[PDB]
Design a protein around this ligand. Sequence first.
Ligand SMILES: CC1=C(/C=C/C(C)=C/C=C/C(C)=C/C=C/C=C(C)/C=C/C=C(C)/C=C/C2=C(C)CCCC2(C)C)C(C)(C)CCC1
Ligand SMILES: CC1=C(C/C=C(/C)CCC[C@H](C)CCC[C@H](C)CCCC(C)C)C(=O)c2ccccc2C1=O
Ligand code: SF4
Ligand code: SF4
Lengths: 72, 150, 141, 137, 81, 39, 728
Amino acid sequence: MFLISWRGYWQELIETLVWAHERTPLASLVRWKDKPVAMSIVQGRLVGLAHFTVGYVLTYAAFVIASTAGKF
Amino acid sequence: PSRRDPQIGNLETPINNSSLVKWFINNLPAYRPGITPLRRGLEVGMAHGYWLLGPFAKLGPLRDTDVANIAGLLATLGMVVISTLAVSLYAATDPPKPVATVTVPNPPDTFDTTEGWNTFASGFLIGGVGGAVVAYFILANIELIQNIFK
Amino acid sequence: VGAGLVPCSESPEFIQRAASARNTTADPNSGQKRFERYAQELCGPEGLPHLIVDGRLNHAGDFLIPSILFLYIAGWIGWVGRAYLQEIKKRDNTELREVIIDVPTALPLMLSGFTWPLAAVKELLSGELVAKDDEIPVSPR
Amino acid sequence: LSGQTPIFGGSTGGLLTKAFREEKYVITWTSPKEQVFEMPTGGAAIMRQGPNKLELARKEYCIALGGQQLRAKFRITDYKIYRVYPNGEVQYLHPSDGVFPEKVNEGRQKVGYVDRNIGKNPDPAKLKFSGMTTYNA
Amino acid sequence: SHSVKIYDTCIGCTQCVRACPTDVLEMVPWDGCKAGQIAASPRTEDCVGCKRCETACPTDFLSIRVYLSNAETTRSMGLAY
Amino acid sequence: MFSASFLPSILVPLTGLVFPAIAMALLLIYVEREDPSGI
Amino acid sequence: SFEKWGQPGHFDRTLAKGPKTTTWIWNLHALAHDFDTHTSDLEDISRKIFAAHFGQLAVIFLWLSGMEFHGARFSNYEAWLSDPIGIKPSAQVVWPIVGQDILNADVGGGFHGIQITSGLFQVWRAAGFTNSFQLYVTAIGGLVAAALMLFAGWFHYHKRAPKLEWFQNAESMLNHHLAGLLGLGCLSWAGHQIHVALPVNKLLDAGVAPKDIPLPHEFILNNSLMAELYPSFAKGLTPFWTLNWGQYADFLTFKGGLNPVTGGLWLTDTAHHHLALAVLFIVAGHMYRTNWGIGHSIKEILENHKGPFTGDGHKGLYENMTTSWHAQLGTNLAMLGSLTIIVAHHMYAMPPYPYLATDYATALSIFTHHMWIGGFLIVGGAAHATIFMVRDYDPAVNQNNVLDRVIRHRDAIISHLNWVCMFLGFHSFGLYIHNDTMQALGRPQDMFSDTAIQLQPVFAQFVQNIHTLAPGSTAPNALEPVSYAFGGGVVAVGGKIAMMPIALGTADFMIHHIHAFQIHVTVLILLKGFLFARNSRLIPDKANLGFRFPCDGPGRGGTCQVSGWDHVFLGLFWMFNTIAIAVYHFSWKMQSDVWGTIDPDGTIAHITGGNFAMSANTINGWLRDYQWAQAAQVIQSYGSALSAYGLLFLGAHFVWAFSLMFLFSGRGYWQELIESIVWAHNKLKVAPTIQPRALSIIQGRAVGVAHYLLGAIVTIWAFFEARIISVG
Ligand SMILES: CC1=C(/C=C/C(C)=C/C=C/C(C)=C/C=C/C=C(C)/C=C/C=C(C)/C=C/C2=C(C)CCCC2(C)C)C(C)(C)CCC1
Ligand SMILES: CC1=C(C/C=C(/C)CCC[C@H](C)CCC[C@H](C)CCCC(C)C)C(=O)c2ccccc2C1=O
Ligand code: SF4
Ligand code: SF4
């Protein structure tokens, strides 16, 4: 998910989603610590790679130790 | 016919400017004038602590055990405590742009200030505890209606 | 030819497979015949033959001459392709004909690849195969 | 300046809380004809006669309208743009060259320069433990 | 915001000044080539990072470059909110 | 169990929950500090 | 007259000059049809569209006639005729050379070949087909008609081409088509049915010597055998002259159910169906205004429907529906897609051909095929909607119309949409994984099926119920319910189920809800690209710049993937997910509690054993209890005569990974590697004059997604094809 989609789509909907808090009542009290925006490009690449590598690591380890301790 | 200019990003749809709804929203304890922030906290605590114990009272992992009433009571106690903690620290770090976004025709009140927020949190704590115990009392005698049996 | 490998002639499981060896094509002798053709090599416990590559005359021709055949044909095709390319450029219709093949000229070049190896050797000794490091102007860096 | 706006019912892509508390852009021009046209915040409207006050939150929309819409279609070339402070001031970003020429003047602004060949460019070796970059000569 | 970089190869066709939608260029008087007026960046503070400008530069090894900095703000990031 | 005391029964929650709580609270109020002092 | 083909780029002025680099090749296969990108004229466009349609029809006729011909000379039809049960139809006999010799699909009677699954013989069990020579003539007719209408296209383009006002008479269009095309064809087919179909169907009850059964010429004017059955069908008694129709109760009846002697329904109902439809939409299609000064002025109807919330109603919509083409294209595509998928979702409860529910191989093949096409083309309908938005519009004729009224408040719409999607998404999936954890946590009482925490879709149950007892009161002149999955008796034949009532317990809930979930997000992506097509809150030049472009530089951070067809990229990924899990669900249920075998007591011993109530609630169960069964033979399903077809499932994974390679990588890397190889080749004087250049990022994205989809769908069809072969 992080790898394929890119930062030209995950910003249009953040606009309209900022539009909400401004105009609903009983929740417009709170405001922003800091104005939120979409991620960055390099950071997106990095997080995608991190997710991929962590996903790759775990399953194989589980498989190998479980198999070795279950078959001898 | 927008609020002040038809080109602004707001619309006069008959759900955010209906007389019924504006009357119903203005007189809420968050906005109704003639009161103190103290009472605001008291009432909000009363309400929320009065309903925020059922959602886990008979729903918790101790759902059908013979104790779950006081269990849910303790749960909502801790809940309202940590909520007060959260709002208090928010007040502690509160004053960038010391306002709230205004859409009600008038400003809500002078409730918008740090120490005001702190007093509000205190009243919230008190009212929440109160609503908790009173709901626990309503729910205490399962026979609350069985004695009436009506 | 060691490594504990039985000859495909006397490997029992080899002939065991050969008995009901599924005759592939439309001729009943297809299977059996091929198994008979597989007596020269030496089988193993798997019952199927391994190939030894050493120039050792036990299995020399079973790998050498196919290699040399491939070298023959690859040399031919590369040679005729390069020759055609070199020829095209002396027409000043370069990329017009890059997609339209000039058959009356493309034929004799193909037909004239008979003696590619030794001719290439000549172009090696004459130095007719490489341009000069700096004359070739394809800029690196 | 002007006190009138084109015919436009309304929409939801108007202003936010950033606008009336950080900045506003303003653009005006002369359209003695009233013709329907498009706007960058979604929807369409129709111009008004003579002065035409269009107020907005960003800048690029005014540039797009002036360049691609006004003089590229309807040949109006005297649209002025301004920036409005939160406390109520009125600034002046433009016309910074008067006639929107983009090439004419008798003298210009002389701010810095660099006419230096790029093959002879500094390396991270020669400029070390400084705060500058290859911009030096 | 980000930094702009000018060179000598500006022929003076002025396709970049008509391409940048951010008003960060102007042709200041020059003398060297037939241009007599070479492009430059007087108003960097509104740089956007679209760099549609050098794509409009026809010169071999296009005469303008943009060194994309790190001191971004609400202006350089371009938010309507 | 063994020769140790109750300790492994209840010493995880505070490290699990409350110490992270104060950690992040202090951290957040730190990342908003005024100038030029900060603790 | 052959001096003209080999002059490429005949339609474009730019790429007509010469192939500088390899790029010139690529665009050659890209702009060969969008001739709206060639001029501003329209009559030429329309003529091209006509000729292209004719060509498509020609290839249609060609392939259908050729498939017939294969069915006549290389298909075991006429042997499978006498026995449609103990014989499995086949075609495409294997050519006896090295490699394809063991693949002789022998289906009894020595007939080898390929055991097909497309159920054309089922049509050939209703059309009453005896000898293959008539079929030979049929193929000849099909191909000659193909060539005929192709010649017609050539003529109507090169000699006499139609004019321009010939386009926009949608009134006569609807009238002619609706009435003449549909009604006349349908009533003609019904006439064929009553004359031939049901007679030979009667004659297929007990082995009545098929070829010996007379030919239609023996019934054109021979009414004697036609008077054997149906006494009112002496001639007809022609009581229609007397307005009396009570006599015709013989054939034109209304049964409405399963006929356990045909493997399908009662064909008389279908005949009377077709009659009713024919006249009904004949009198319908006689509506609109034409050349006799009588009818609806349809451009005024839409003018009338306005009001307070409407604004100004449907004013000004015909310029869009006739001046532009992509509009019509998109809407008709969407409608066809929806229609097709309901067709798929339809013909597994009311089999309209002989031997359908009894034939458990063709069913899901047809189902999944049509279902895939449906989505696969409705997304294209939406894409053409977007291309209309970018190509065709007007600021003048679109003032305050019901169209413009949404493009002004898009943000609220899409925000609430995102809200709904988030809600449904985790409300379903996180609930699922919650139950997963509970089962893995020795807390089984926290499960969610009937044996645990409760939830029951009462609405479906009550609607099915009120459908069960329909006849008599709602349907007095009706005999049996419309289907038997709602209610009725378990209808069957042999030890083989035809249709039983379907049970909706607990597992139905989250399945339908995640269906709705994914449909919601799909609409989200597509509609988002739709509205934010011309102007975004940051990019006000989109329509000013195009809809097929990669990015707008690293401004505002990143902006890559801001066109619309990348929106439809993501959307097609999502619809892939949707339809994939949909077919998973359908196949598993209709093999778990609908299909199996039967005992003399009607005892339905289903294939799997009702596995949803047992495992279709946790994720680990979903992989175990589905693909364990869906593959446990494909590993060994090769290795004998009617097994040798080692399937390319082992093969499709490779194309899948090769696919994903294209996605994750840029292009500059490949460009530099190319330049190095060029250096080497130039050193050895073999430099190709046409300088190779790496793919453009949009090209690479396209080939990546194409290969991805191809691999996935190949994999899955291999899966269930072999799975049905293991039972069919
Ligand atoms: C779905 C599909 C399909 C199918 C199709 C179809 C099946 C169609 C149908 C069609 C049809 C079914 C048609 C028909 C038509 C007909 C018509 C249209 C008729 C008309 C008639 C008339 C016109 C008449 C005339 C006359 C006469 C004859 C005599 C005298 C009188 C008159 C003149 C009246 C296919 C496979 C392809 C593909 C896939 C899908
Ligand atoms: C491989 C690859 C390339 C390499 C670029 C090219 C053009 C490789 C194409 C090689 C040729 C054109 C493939 C030909 C396929 C045929 C099977 C080859 C047959 C040729 C002989 C039979 C004559 C990119 O440029 C690229 C760009 C952006 C994202 C991903 C990628 C990417 O994945
Ligand atoms: S940078 Fe390009 S557009 Fe600008 S002056 Fe030089 S040549 Fe002209
Ligand atoms: S990104 Fe390019 S065009 Fe835009 S302001 Fe910067 S230099 Fe000018």
